Amino acid sequence: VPDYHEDIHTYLREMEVKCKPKVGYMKKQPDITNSMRAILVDWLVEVGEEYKLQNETLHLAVNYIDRFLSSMSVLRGKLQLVGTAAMLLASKFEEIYPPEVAEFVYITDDTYTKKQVLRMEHLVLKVLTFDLAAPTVNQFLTQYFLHQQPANCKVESLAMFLGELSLIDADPYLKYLPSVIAGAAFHLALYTVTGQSWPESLIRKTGYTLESLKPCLMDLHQTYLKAPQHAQQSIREKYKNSKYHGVSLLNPPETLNL
């Protein structure tokens, strides 16, 4: 327990700054775009569902892709190979048993070789300087869920859903830290289910006021409204499972009452 909850949260706050990607990176990518990055992340969410991977694995993979794309320019023909080695590395970090390399080749429809994927694994670690223990939205939400006043596993699911949705859209969501994304998602999911709001516990722990969250909340409210319409659907189709209380069936509030 809690002998470490405060230390860890503070330190997760330190680490998130050091594991920030460059925000304006996509505009310096010649061959690739926010929209192609959205294809890739959606696809990872499917791959994660196919091989029953944890949600952390997914967020970590997305963090690797962004930091790597911050320093390294990549042709479209090679983005998915970047994605696949990110997902391998994340699984190796986070999973108890990772799917074998072969399976990572298989899920691209045999377009890259095992040896390619392994050589890209190597190159991802070099550019990341073996720094793979990045804080995610998923990590922050889990700590936040400790401060839920009665616990409510529809709120929990619905926030997870929002946080995964932020993975998909680089602009706007790269401008926000994971700890803020998660503040937004938590409040949003809270609000939506019970009509309550981002609680004082967490205001004093995080030092975030509702109103400091406001901008991120506005961006995430829109995504939440627009989700049915988005080109990318894997996360919505993931969150209809009874596993997740089909929170993605639920009804977004049309106003936020700020």
């Binding site: 479209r76 023909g77 998915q80 377009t111």
Partner: peptide
């Protein structure tokens, strides 16, 4: 699934 090309 092969994406892009």
């Amino acid at each position: 699934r092969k994406l892009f090309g």
